[PDB]
Subunit: 100 residues, 2 copies
């Protein structure tokens, strides 16, 4: 459970094995499940994020979520990536991030 | 805080999904401190994939609502946050979370 101060940069990764499969990113916090974006290899398929505050970085042959300015209220929780295949989801390792 | 339901060992648990019924493929899973664990998926009333053992879990489709029925609760395996997620437009739409814990 990485702790971050207000305004710090945060990088969230996904350790899923590479495939060419549609992969969803989302997060779970105390207000609910919140959908972030989806990719297939390096191509964005849907993005609910404001570009001002969040970047989907596809440099270095992998995909990561960059939070430009951490805010406890909004960005705290469990981050999940899920690859879909065979009518099911395959999950990566969770990343948990909190404030103070 | 966070609202949750508390169960004794061996109680039945019914988990619901408040997503509006459309006929969109819907993934059911749970998150605990070991990770995210995939459960089953359903399109309307039709199972499309089920990783659950029938002896311990039943996917109940009576009423044209889908419920997961846990036959006999076990805190060590069954505690966590249960999620349902419909897929459309290359994204997920989530129902309200259901958290479930054992007695301490």
């Amino acid at each position: 459970a990485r702790i971050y101060k207000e305004g710090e940069k945060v990088q969230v990764d996904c350790d899923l094995k590479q495939s060419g499969t549609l992969t969803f990113w989302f997060r779970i916090n105390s207000k609910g499940a919140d959908y972030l974006f989806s990719v297939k290899s390096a191509d964005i398929k849907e993005n609910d994020l404001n570009s001002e505050h969040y970047t989907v970085n596809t440099n270095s042959g992998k995909v990561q979520l960059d939070i430009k300015s951490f805010k406890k209220k909004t960005d705290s929780g469990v981050y999940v990536c899920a690859a879909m295949n065979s009518n099911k989801l395959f999950f990566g390792g969770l990343t948990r991030i909190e404030g103070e």
